[PDB]
Enzyme design. Structure first.
Site, short mmCIF file in Angstrom:
data_model
loop_
_atom_site.label_atom_id
_atom_site.label_comp_id
_atom_site.label_asym_id
_atom_site.label_seq_id
_atom_site.Cartn_x
_atom_site.Cartn_y
_atom_site.Cartn_z
N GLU A 50 0.81 -1.18 0.00
CA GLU A 50 0.00 0.00 0.00
C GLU A 50 0.85 1.24 0.00
OE1 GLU A 50 -4.00 0.35 1.60
OE2 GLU A 50 -3.09 1.26 3.37
N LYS A 52 0.76 5.16 0.69
CA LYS A 52 0.05 6.26 1.34
C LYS A 52 1.03 7.14 2.11
CE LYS A 52 -1.19 3.85 5.54
NZ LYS A 52 -1.84 2.54 5.69
N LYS A 109 -7.98 2.48 -3.19
CA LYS A 109 -8.41 2.56 -1.81
C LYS A 109 -8.91 3.97 -1.58
CE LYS A 109 -7.39 -0.44 1.79
NZ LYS A 109 -6.62 0.14 2.92
N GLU A 158 -14.42 -4.84 2.45
CA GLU A 158 -13.83 -4.78 3.77
C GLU A 158 -14.80 -4.90 4.95
OE1 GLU A 158 -10.43 -2.17 4.63
OE2 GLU A 158 -11.84 -1.28 6.08
N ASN A 179 -10.23 -6.17 8.19
CA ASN A 179 -9.39 -5.11 8.75
C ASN A 179 -9.23 -5.26 10.25
OD1 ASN A 179 -7.87 -2.80 8.93
ND2 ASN A 179 -9.34 -1.53 7.87
N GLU A 209 -5.95 -7.40 6.52
CA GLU A 209 -5.53 -6.00 6.48
C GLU A 209 -5.13 -5.47 7.84
OE1 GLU A 209 -9.51 -4.78 4.50
OE2 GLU A 209 -8.06 -3.43 3.61
N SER A 210 -4.10 -4.64 7.86
CA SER A 210 -3.60 -3.96 9.06
C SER A 210 -2.89 -4.75 10.17
CB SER A 210 -4.72 -3.12 9.70
OG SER A 210 -5.29 -2.18 8.80
#
Length: 247
Positions: A50, A52, A109, A158, A179, A209-210
């Site tokens: 990702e 960002k 995203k 998600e 997530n 995710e995360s």
């Protein structure tokens, strides 16, 4: 959308007024979920890198988009590009540019609440889109999914809790992201995440995710049946780290 409080309510209002992108798609749709499945078959760890420069749970990290992308194109199964402006400092141009430089699947995203945002993703070059169950109603979620499928995209839906999981299964989702971070509180709960992962039917492609920082977290999640792993923060600071999760 649903009734939201705080930042989630704000980002949603920004998204409703987000200007549409008018241009034509150059590239073809490179399916992310199917690529995740093939990697699985070839026993290659499927990591979604990702990009960002900013987020609610972190300090700003400036890094060149094109360079990050070209480097990850050698390792990642795909890329997740943030296009939300205010809280993530993302933009459409950054996606447009990256999409032109790489040929691996790209996930847009953002906080998608209207159909034009899916048109944008299509025109900008994204191969898929992220739909967040907690900000959308069941009806909205169903239409946007169907609308994305009409473009040939299979959205990453998600979820964050059992309520979200229920709806995701009810609307016929096949590509789901679990997530570990609650978008609202920004709290991470891995126990809840492992619980949800084991409630998801074997046939849906599962993306964790995360919260991933070590390769052994990946190996464990993997024995639980997780197909892909979306890793952001750690990779923005030291891209090279991917070589470590990847072996």
């Amino acid at each position: 959308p649903r009734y939201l409080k705080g930042w989630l309510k704000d980002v949603v209002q920004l998204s409703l007024r987000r200007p549409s992108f008018r241009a034509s798609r150059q590239r073809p749709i490179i399916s992310l979920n199917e690529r995740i499945l093939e990697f699985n078959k070839r026993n290659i760890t499927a990591i979604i890198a990702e990009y960002k420069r900013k987020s609610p749970s972190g300090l700003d990290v400036e890094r060149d988009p094109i360079e990050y992308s070209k480097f990850m194109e050698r390792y990642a199964v795909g890329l997740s590009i943030l296009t939300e402006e205010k809280y993530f400092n993302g933009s459409y141009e950054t996606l447009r540019k990256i999409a032109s430089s790489v040929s691996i699947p790209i996930l847009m995203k953002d906080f998608i609440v209207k159909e034009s945002q899916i048109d944008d993703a299509y025109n900008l070059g994204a191969d898929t889109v992220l739909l967040i169950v907690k900000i959308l109603t069941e009806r909205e979620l169903e239409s946007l999914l169907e609308y994305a499928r009409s473009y040939g995209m299979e959205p990453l839906i998600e979820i964050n809790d059992e309520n979200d999981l229920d709806i995701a299964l009810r609307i016929g989702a096949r590509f789901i992201g679990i997530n570990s971070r609650d978008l609202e509180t920004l709290e991470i709960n891995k126990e809840n995440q492992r619980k949800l992962i084991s409630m998801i039917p074997s046939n849906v492609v599962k993306v964790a995710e995360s919260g991933i920082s070590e390769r052994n977290e990946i190996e464990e999640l993997r024995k639980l049946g997780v197909n892909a792993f979306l890793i952001g923060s750690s990779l923005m600071r030291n891209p090279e780290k991917i070589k470590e999760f990847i072996l």
